Structure formats: structure tokens, C-alpha cells
Write a sequence for this structure.
């Protein structure tokens, strides 16, 4: 009966990890940051509105220059916007219209998209002779593609619904490393600022910190009660925020190995679809299912503003690398640039 | 079955044997970092409209 | 501004092409096909003629789009909102699988999936076209085996007409919103025709209900 | 008695009962009509989200009904004073052109609505159901032009004739000649009635040929198809039948005695007041009686 | 690649044709820059993507006409009245305009034919010592400032190797064209612009042209032969 012995050992071992977690909990984030002055009410005006999509918008990603952004929609079109003049630089027709993610290469010569076809496709924007054409179709996943992020011009990390992430090589199209350990579908991921680690949110209410090089999970985080819909890294790199389906946000710290503060209100019962941080990390913008975006004071866990300008569910969020704007997409086929 | 349980147990021991710091030590870094970039945040502190790339 | 004015007319040339594709896509009928794997969905597809399977067929100058999600094997809730907006949902259930087990028999597995897909919060007004395939294999099996293995509360003769009508009644009983959506039930033979016609008739009623919504009558 | 209007043997009456019945009847049409059509205009402009081809036509019908309502206070004073126009010459023609161009405008923008509903039920896959918001705007302006072009003759007429010590402003006077305005008044009913009845009968028959009447909301829509057909006949047949009788008396008896027309002339102007009944019931029947 | 053109005629008319090949010709705006036997380049005409806005040089406004045929990927130029002032080699240049694009990147082979206000770019320097291995700077000047309010100075640097078509080195103030070695550099001040070369190779000889793109009646700088 080694199965029962192993199960008992895991429960005892998990108790030891839990015992060490509360031992280091000397204080709380709210208690420490109670003396700080609030950021005050924040009002963001719609500085721009981008039209041209004819279906629900599922994902967008800001360019590294903080001027271009790529938006993915379910009508089969990938559109690159000039966020300063609303100009459409490119319009990429996709083979499959069921796309749930889009990524922008840090160099800017590539974009990626994927979805229910279980294939991540890389498109060449440089196009030395002609227009934008596909470059590689990274097949090998078993479930739907839920997120994808570029590490460089030749490496991309993709998380799918088959409970396993992966690290690809664009030149050969082979899975360099496969990450396993999740018990549910992986719905999002966020690369570290130093591009050495990343965190993945799954449907089992757990976020796991991976290592790109070694390929083994380093830490696990619990505290959510429903599916984690979106994850994002703190700009420092020693924390991250998760958005689950129980209408709550949590800020986990990579060194304390435990949740620090929670961002919940009694008025909101709708789950969070997207989260993002400001340039300094003081503001935690979260997109909800109740047709508007919210701004949270990450250091005091107090509501500080509402970006109510959408007539449908907000499905994606983005903050420029410069930090001077916020673009929020939604299912009403509209993108809006705020402040 | 046994190997899968052994793999989970072996991986679980790796997370237990890690170096942890107090929350107050960790929360101090988050507060110190936020005031290190307090003035460099356009969203927290609005900049003059002349420097806005989207207003005009 | 010389180069900027040329960049604006490029965006406008992109805009006029986006509308042209959107007009073409709006004139197509999107359907969703579901089943229990070996329920005859492949058999149904032939009559109307990894990842997602897309099928194209036309009938009476109407272009249909069929999507098969039988190879996903993932959490249905996380990607079911993508199909919210299809004209109709096609459900395939094999009547011959009332005694085969996957435990629990395969028929109750079909009923469990039908209960969730019909009562989904995203599908509250989409018509469901229910296809009961394998009627030839079901009519011979009832002679040698009763229906009591499937439904223990069954009380009737072991004849095709009575047994077939009881299974249809059990599947329609799972419809909780009896006043908002209509469930179309058809009995599909292994080698038969007019099944694409049954979809055309059911889809037309959806378009009429859609057209009246623009005019405000319905 | 007898009057001459442009070399035409015409009989004009000034009955006492006109003052006692018509300003009451016309009073209730304006006071709620301003609230009925006016409030419906507010929702159409500052509370709607998506504009489609069907909503554009209902807007043109709404604005046509609103303009007819503001004619009533000018109409009512002519009735309280017992056919005594004290408003001038040019205003008299304006209150006759814009009172008649509106009524044909409202009639035109409900056959279009009836035809619009016919194509959305009997031919659901027809290309006419997917016209853009521009093609409806072109059609609405084109239908306005033919409406105006069929009543421009009213403006060129010097109407404020002298009736003894009274000024008579009226485009519907009993005259023994063939006039286009009299013919146009008849065609305002007989032609649209055929299209409305044909479109309303085919819609309900088709919605019952295929078993769609079991749905609760389809039953709600089916009844309102009869309602728009019932209201149209109720609000427009009484005036037409009397006018047909007037055309009969002219042929058999003539203008040699202007006494047989005493009863019908009073009746005709009372029944003509039911033509503004339709412009009152339209906001309730057409716009306020929808799920949206 | 692209090629095609007309031949010699006496004072008559001729139709110039270009044959695009494998670069998605339907989404490229094409020019018709021409170069006389011994002078610098001179812009002639332009037709945008989708045959939209069309511009002509002041000297060929009434006589010339430019049109494109997106199927079969062919560009046309029809000249009606032809004088002795317009004998030149007619080059075909492609150019696409979006946010980060590089116009005038590829130049056609060009064909010759014999018949038997605006912005002025000076480029005063006309001859430079040709010794290998030196760091040479080529200067330019403009009548009015090219620094648009957008923040980018529209100035393009072209190199014409002896016997071949012009090739784009630098587009706008400092951006380096694709395939150009990083030795070339470009800096300007809105009115005065310089092109810097670190180490001259044996393939760096030729005529260097500067072109503005602020106002569409655009002019070149007559070149500075090394
Ligand atoms: C009774 C009448 C009128 C009377 C006085 C001033 C204006 C209009 O209304 C009409 C009409 O509905 O067109 C014709 C008329 O003679
Ligand atoms: C009016 O009637 C008189 C006699 O009844 C007749 O002489 C005259 O011609 C008639 N006028 C017209 C215009 O018919």
C-alpha cells in the first residue's frame, strides 16, 4: 500500500510548507503601508478610440516603442494600430478565426497568435519583399492556446489548455523545454522583466513560478478559489498579481512565498479578465466582466478609479512600456486609449 | 501511480528547502521601490498636457 | 505631411477591405456540432456534403459553416463563449448506445452533456437541432434487449415507435427554458437524405426570428 | 350656400355644430400627440444605440406625424371662429400644404414599414433585408421628394377667398369639377390598403404555415400586425366613404341646389378629423409596443 | 526586380512601361524618376496605391500621364508631346508609406530614350578626394527646414554606383536602409545635413544624391561625385 503511504507523506510535507509560510508572516502589507498617503482619485479620459474590428476582441499587446499595438479579434483579422493617429499599419488575415491571444516581438519584426487550432503562428512584419507573411506554425500542443509571450526573436513561451506550458525555438519549430505540473488548463502567463522566470495561472486556482533555463517549477502559490483568468508581473520582478473568476485580485510575493494583499469589493461579483501594472507599480488596473475597467491602489488595496467606457465585457488590457497610456479592449470590437 | 506520487513528493521537497524572508522585509522593498519611481509614473502623477503624446 | 498623408490613405484602403470581408462573413450561417465522439457526427457531416474542424457546404443559395469541437478534450467552460452567436447548435446522439458503457452507460453521458449545453448561460436563445442517429441499429437491438438497462423507470412495449418516442421525450425534458428556445428533434437513419433540409428549415426560423429583432416586432 | 372659387360652382357651408364638436375632438389629438410623437422623437435621437434600416423608416414616420400635430392649433382656431381665417394669405397655403403633405407622408411611411416587415418574414434570405444605413437614407429622402412633389400645387393657389364677411381657408370644398387633390385623397387609401392587407395577410399566413406561432413572442407580434391594419382602416375609411358619397351626389343631382350636401359636408369634416387619429396612435402602436 | 521601357523616336510620342516582379506590386506607390545623360536625378510623376492621388512634375504636368495596372503587375507612362529638354534615362522606383516604412528602397534598371514654390537642395560640393580608408563627410543644404512637426526630418540619401541604378542608403534623418553596412551615418539640423562614411571601400565610389520629401514637388541635390 505504497500509494496510501505516499499520499500521507505529501500531506505531511505540505503541512511543513504551510507551517513555514505563516512563520515568516511577521506583518501584512496593509499594516506596513498604512502610514502612506493615498494616491487620490484618478480620472482617465478616453484619449483615442480605434475602430475597424467587426467581432469580439480577445487580446492585444503593446509594442516595445509604446506607439504600435497589435489587436486580435474573432473575425479572423490581426490589426496593427498606430496608437498616435489611429492609423492601421497592417491587417493580417488569419487561417483560423478562433484566436485567443496575440503577442508582439520585443524587436518588433514578428507577431504571434494562436487559439482553438492548437497552433501558434509567427508572422514576419519586416517583409523584405512584399507584405506580411507567416513564418512558422508551432504545432505540438494538445489543447487550445491561451497565451504566448516572446522571449526574443527566436524564443517564445506558449501556455495551452493541456495543463502544460512550453518553450519553443522559432528556427526549428521544436519544443526546447516542456513545463508540467499544473492540474488544470493554463489560462495566462507573464514573463519576468529579466526574462529568466515566468508565472502561469491555471484553472486549479494555483500559480506556479517556472524557470526558463532549468525547466523545473520553483515555487507554487495558492489562495484563490476559482480559475485564474489573467496574471502579470510586478515591474520590480519580486511580485505578481493574479485575477481569478471569484472577482478578487491577489498580490503574491516571490520571496515571502505567500499572498500579501487582496483587492476585492462587495459591489463587484464578476470575475477579472485582465490585469496590468503601471510603470511604477503603484496602480493595479484590472478589467472586469461587468463592462468596465478598474484601478486599484496596489499599496493600500483601495479603489481609486473606474474606466467605464465599454458597452461589453473587457477582455484585454495593456500599459505602454513608456507608461503614458492604457489601452483596454472589449467584446464590443472597440479599443480605447486612456490618458 | 507510485512513480507519479514519488515525483510530486520529490518536487514538493524542493520548494520546502528554500530561503524565505519576513513579510515586513519583503513589503519594505515594494514600498521603497514605489517611491523610487514616484515621479517617473505618468499615470500616478499626470504630466503637463504639452508633454502628452496623445492629447495633442 | 507628404509621407503622412500617404499613410492615411493606406489605412483607408485597409478599412474598405475590412468592410468587404465583414459583409461576406455576415452572409454566412455558423453552426456548432457536438456529440459523444462516436455518436455519428462524422456520419452526419457526410450527409450535409488536431484542433478544430471546419466544414463548408451550401444549400439553396445559403452558405453554412460547421465547426466540430470533438477533439478538444479540455474544460468546455473556458472556450464555450467563443461560439456564442451561432445560428443553431447541432447535437448528435446515437440511439444504439443506450446499453453500451464507457460504470455509466454512454447514453447517460450524452444526456449529461446535453443538459449543460442546453442550459448554458451563453446559449439561452440559440435553437438546438437534436439528431438521433443509428436508428437502424436501435430498431434491431430492442428486439433482443430491453430499454430497462438505460432507463429503469421505463414502462412500455419493446417496439421501435414507443421506445424512440420515449428517448426523445427524455432529451427534450432536459430543456429548462421551454419558453425562450426551441429544440428540434429528428430521427436520422444511417443511409438517408433530407437531413440537410431539416437544418435548412430550422436555420430559416432562426433568421426570421433574427430579422424580426431588427424591425422590433420580436 | 353658394360660392365661386376660380370659376367653379362650389357649395360652402358654415354649420354651428362644427364649433361645438371639432375643437373638442381636435383638442385631445394635439395635447397627447405632442406628448406621444414628441417623446418618441427624444428616444429615437438621444436614447438609441444602433440604427438599422427598419428604425430609419420608423423615424421618418415619426417626424411626419410630429409635423402634422403642430398644424392643429392653427386648424383649431379656424374651427372655433367658424371658418374665419385671420392668419394671412401665405400662412393659409402653408397650413394647407404641410397638413396634406404630412398625411400622405405618414401614409407613405407605413406601407414602407409594412413592406419592410413583409420581406423579413416571407423572404428572409432576400438581399433587401441587409441594406445599409445609407440606402435607407437615400430612400427616405426620395420618398419625401415624391410626397412633396405631389402637393406642390397647393402652394400656388390663392386660397383665402372671401365668403361674405368671412375668410374661408379650405382645400376640401364641394366643387363640381375633377381635381387631382380629390383624386389624390382617394389614392391615399385605396392603393396603400391593398399593399398593407397583402403584406399583413402573407406575414401571418407564413408565420403559421411553418409552426412558429407556438412561441409566445411570435403571438405578440402577430396580433400587432392586425392592429396596424385595423387602425389604418378605422382612421381612414370614414372620410373616404363620405367623399365617395359626395362624388355620387354631384353626378346624379349636381350643383343646381346646394342643400342636399348639408348633412354630408358636416359629416365629412368630422370624419376627416379621424385622419389625425392615426398620427396619434402611431407612437403607441408602432414604437412603444415593441420589446426594444 | 523590374524592367522595361521605350526606344528612340524623332519628336513624337512613346509609352513607358515597367514590369514588376514578385514584391506585391498592388500595395506599393510608384514613381518615375528620370535622369538626363549628364545631370542629376529629377522626379517626374507618382501614382499611389490603389490608383488614388497622382502628382506630376511642373515641367511634365500637361504632356505626361501615369497609370498602373495592378493585374499583371505593370506600370505605364504615356508621353504625348516630347521636346529636346526631356531626353533621359527613366527609372522606376517603388515606395510604400506606413509608420516605419522605407520609401524609395528599390530602384528599377531604367531605360533610355533620345529625341534628337519648390524646395531647392544645393549640395555645393562637387568633387572629393577618392583615397581608400579615409573618413569623408558629404554635406547638403535646403532652402527651408525639413523638420516637420511630427519630429522627423524628411531627407533621403541615394548612392549611384557608376553604371548601375541608384540605391537608397539613408531614409529620413538617420535611419539606415536594410542591407546597408553600418559604416554610413547621417546627421542633420533641419536645414544643413551631412552624411558620414567611416571607411571607404572600393565599392563606395559614385555619385551621392540627397532628396527631400516634405512637399511633394520634391527635388534632388545634383550629386557630389567622389
Ligand atoms: C380641413 C382642412 C383645413 C382647413 C383649414 C386650414 C387648413 C386645413 O384640412 C385639410 C387637410 O386635412 O388637408 C383640408 C382642409 O380644408
Ligand atoms: C354653374 O351652374 C350654372 C347654372 O347652374 C352654369 O350655367 C355654369 O356653367 C356652371 N359653372 C360651371 C363652371 O360649370
Amino acid at each position: 500500500s505504497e500509494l496510501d503511504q505516499l499520499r500521507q507523506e505529501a500531506e505531511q510535507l505540505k503541512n511543513q510548507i504551510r507551517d513555514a509560510r505563516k512563520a515568516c508572516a511577521d506583518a501584512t502589507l496593509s499594516q506596513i503601508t498604512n502610514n502612506i498617503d493615498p494616491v487620490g482619485r484618478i480620472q482617465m479620459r478616453t484619449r483615442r478610440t480605434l475602430r475597424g474590428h467587426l467581432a469580439k476582441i480577445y487580446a492585444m499587446h503593446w509594442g516595445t516603442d509604446s506607439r504600435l499595438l497589435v489587436s486580435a479579434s474573432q473575425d479572423g483579422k490581426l490589426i496593427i494600430w498606430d496608437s498616435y493617429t489611429t492609423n492601421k499599419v497592417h491587417a493580417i488575415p488569419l487561417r483560423s478565426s478562433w484566436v485567443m491571444t496575440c503577442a508582439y516581438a520585443p524587436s518588433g519584426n514578428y507577431v504571434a497568435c494562436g487559439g482553438l487550432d492548437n497552433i501558434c503562428s509567427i508572422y514576419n512584419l519586416k517583409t523584405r519583399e512584399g507584405n506580411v507573411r507567416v513564418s512558422r506554425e508551432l504545432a505540438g500542443h494538445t489543447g487550445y492556446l491561451s497565451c504566448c509571450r516572446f522571449l526574443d526573436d527566436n524564443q517564445i513561451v506558449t501556455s495551452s489548455g493541456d495543463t502544460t506550458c512550453a518553450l519553443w525555438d522559432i528556427e526549428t519549430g521544436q519544443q526546447t523545454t516542456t513545463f508540467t505540473g499544473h492540474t488544470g488548463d493554463v489560462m495566462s502567463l507573464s514573463l519576468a522583466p529579466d526574462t529568466r522566470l515566468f508565472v502561469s495561472g491555471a484553472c486549479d486556482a494555483s500559480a506556479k513560478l517556472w524557470d526558463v533555463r532549468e525547466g523545473m517549477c520553483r515555487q507554487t502559490f495558492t489562495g484563490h478559489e476559482s480559475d485564474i483568468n489573467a496574471i502579470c508581473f510586478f515591474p520590480n520582478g519580486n511580485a505578481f498579481a493574479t485575477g481569478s473568476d471569484d472577482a478578487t485580485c491577489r498580490l503574491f510575493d516571490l520571496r515571502a512565498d505567500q499572498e500579501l494583499m487582496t483587492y476585492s469589493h462587495d459591489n463587484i461579483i464578476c470575475g477579472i479578465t485582465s490585469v496590468s501594472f503601471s510603470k511604477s507599480g503603484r496602480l493595479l488596473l484590472a478589467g472586469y466582466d461587468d463592462f468596465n475597467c478598474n484601478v486599484w491602489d496596489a499599496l493600500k488595496a483601495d479603489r481609486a478609479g473606474v474606466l467605464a467606457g465599454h458597452d461589453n465585457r473587457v477582455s484585454c488590457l495593456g500599459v505602454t512600456d513608456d507608461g503614458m497610456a492604457v489601452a483596454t479592449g472589449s467584446w464590443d470590437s472597440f479599443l480605447k486609449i486612456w490618458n | 501511480s507510485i512513480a507519479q506520487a514519488r515525483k510530486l513528493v520529490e518536487q514538493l521537497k524542493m520548494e520546502a528547502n528554500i530561503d524565505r524572508i519576513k513579510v515586513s522585509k519583503a513589503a519594505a522593498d515594494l514600498m521603497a521601490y514605489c517611491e523610487a519611481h514616484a515621479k517617473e509614473d505618468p499615470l500616478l502623477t499626470p504630466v503637463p498636457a504639452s508633454e502628452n503624446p496623445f492629447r495633442e | 505631411s507628404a509621407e503622412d498623408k500617404a499613410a492615411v490613405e493606406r489605412s483607408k484602403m485597409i478599412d474598405r477591405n475590412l468592410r468587404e470581408d465583414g459583409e461576406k462573413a455576415a452572409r454566412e450561417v455558423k453552426l456548432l456540432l457536438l456529440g459523444a465522439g462516436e455518436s455519428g457526427k462524422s456520419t452526419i457531416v457526410k450527409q450535409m456534403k488536431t484542433g478544430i474542424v471546419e466544414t463548408h457546404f451550401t444549400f439553396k443559395d445559403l452558405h453554412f459553416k460547421m465547426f466540430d469541437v470533438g477533439a478538444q478534450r479540455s474544460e468546455r467552460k473556458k472556450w464555450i463563449h467563443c461560439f456564442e452567436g451561432v445560428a443553431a447548435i447541432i447535437f448528435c446522439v446515437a440511439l444504439s448506445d443506450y446499453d453500451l458503457v464507457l460504470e455509466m452507460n454512454r447514453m447517460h453521458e450524452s444526456m449529461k452533456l446535453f443538459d449543460s449545453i442546453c442550459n448554458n448561460k451563453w446559449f439561452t436563445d440559440t435553437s438546438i437541432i437534436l439528431f438521433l442517429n443509428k436508428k437502424d441499429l436501435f430498431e434491431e437491438k430492442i428486439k433482443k434487449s430491453p430499454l430497462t438497462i438505460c432507463y429503469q423507470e421505463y414502462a412500455g412495449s419493446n417496439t421501435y415507435e414507443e421506445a424512440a418516442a420515449y428517448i426523445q421525450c427524455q432529451f427534450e425534458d432536459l430543456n429548462k427554458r421551454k419558453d425562450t428556445k426551441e429544440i428540434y428533434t429528428h430521427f436520422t437513419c444511417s443511409t438517408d437524405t433530407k437531413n440537410v433540409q431539416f437544418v435548412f428549415d430550422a436555420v430559416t426560423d432562426v433568421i426570421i426570428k433574427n430579422n424580426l429583432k431588427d424591425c422590433g416586432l420580436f | 350656400h353658394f360660392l365661386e372659387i376660380d370659376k367653379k360652382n362650389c357649395c360652402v357651408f358654415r354649420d354651428d355644430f362644427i364649433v361645438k364638436v371639432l375643437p373638442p375632438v381636435l383638442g385631445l389629438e394635439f395635447i397627447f400627440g405632442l406628448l406621444g410623437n414628441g417623446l418618441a422623437l427624444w428616444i429615437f435621437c438621444f436614447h438609441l444605440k444602433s440604427w438599422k434600416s427598419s428604425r430609419i423608416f420608423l423615424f421618418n414616420l415619426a417626424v411626419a406625424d410630429f409635423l402634422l400635430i403642430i398644424c392643429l392649433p392653427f386648424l383649431m382656431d379656424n374651427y372655433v371662429r367658424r371658418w374665419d381665417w385671420k392668419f394671412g394669405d401665405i400662412p393659409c397655403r402653408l397650413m394647407l400644404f404641410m397638413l396634406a403633405m404630412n398625411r400622405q407622408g405618414s401614409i407613405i411611411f407605413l406601407t414602407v414599414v409594412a413592406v419592410d416587415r413583409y420581406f423579413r418574414v416571407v423572404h428572409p434570405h432576400h438581399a433587401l433585408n441587409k441594406i445599409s444605413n445609407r440606402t435607407a437614407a437615400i430612400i427616405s429622402c426620395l420618398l419625401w421628394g415624391i410626397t412633396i412633389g405631389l402637393t406642390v400645387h397647393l402652394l400656388k393657389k390663392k386660397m383665402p377667398i372671401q365668403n361674405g364677411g368671412a375668410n374661408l381657408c379650405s382645400s376640401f370644398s364641394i366643387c363640381h369639377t375633377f381635381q387631382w387633390h380629390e383624386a389624390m385623397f382617394l389614392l391615399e387609401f385605396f392603393l396603400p390598403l391593398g399593399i398593407i392587407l397583402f403584406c399583413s395577410a402573407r406575414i401571418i399566413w407564413s408565420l403559421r404555415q411553418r409552426q412558429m406561432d407556438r412561441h409566445a413572442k411570435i403571438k405578440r407580434a402577430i396580433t400587432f400586425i392586425m392592429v396596424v391594419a385595423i387602425v389604418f382602416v378605422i382612421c381612414f375609411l370614414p372620410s373616404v366613404v363620405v367623399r365617395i358619397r359626395i362624388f355620387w351626389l354631384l353626378h346624379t343631382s349636381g350643383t343646381q341646389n346646394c342643400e342636399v350636401y348639408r348633412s354630408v359636408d358636416l359629416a365629412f369634416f368630422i370624419t376627416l378629423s379621424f385622419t389625425y387619429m392615426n398620427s396619434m396612435l402611431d407612437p403607441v402602436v408602432y414604437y412603444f409596443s415593441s420589446p426594444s | 526586380v523590374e524592367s522595361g521601357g521605350g526606344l528612340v523616336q524623332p519628336g513624337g510620342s512613346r509609352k513607358l512601361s515597367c514590369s514588376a516582379s514578385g514584391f506585391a506590386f498592388s500595395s506599393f506607390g510608384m514613381h518615375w524618376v528620370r535622369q538626363a545623360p549628364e545631370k542629376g536625378l529629377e522626379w517626374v510623376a507618382y501614382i499611389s496605391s490603389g490608383s488614388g492621388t497622382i502628382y506630376y512634375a511642373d515641367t511634365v504636368k500637361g504632356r505626361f500621364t501615369i497609370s498602373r495596372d495592378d493585374p499583371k503587375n505593370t506600370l505605364f507612362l504615356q508621353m504625348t508631346s516630347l521636346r529636346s529638354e526631356d531626353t533621359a534615362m527613366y527609372y522606376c522606383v517603388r515606395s510604400i508609406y506606413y509608420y516605419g516604412s522605407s520609401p524609395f528602397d528599390f530602384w528599377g534598371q531604367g531605360t533610355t530614350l533620345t529625341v534628337s514654390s519648390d524646395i531647392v537642395m544645393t549640395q555645393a560640393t562637387s568633387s572629393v578626394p577618392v583615397t581608400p580608408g579615409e573618413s569623408v563627410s558629404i554635406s547638403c543644404r535646403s532652402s527651408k527646414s525639413l523638420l516637420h512637426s511630427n519630429g522627423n526630418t524628411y531627407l533621403y540619401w541615394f548612392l549611384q554606383r557608376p553604371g548601375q541604378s541608384p540605391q537608397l542608403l539613408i531614409y529620413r534623418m538617420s535611419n539606415l536602409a536594410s542591407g546597408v553596412p553600418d559604416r554610413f551615418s547621417g546627421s542633420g539640423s533641419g536645414t544643413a545635413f551631412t552624411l558620414t562614411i567611416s571607411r571607404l571601400e572600393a565599392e563606395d565610389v559614385g555619385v551621392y544624391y540627397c532628396m527631400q520629401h516634405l512637399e511633394y514637388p520634391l527635388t534632388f541635390g545634383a550629386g557630389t561625385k567622389l
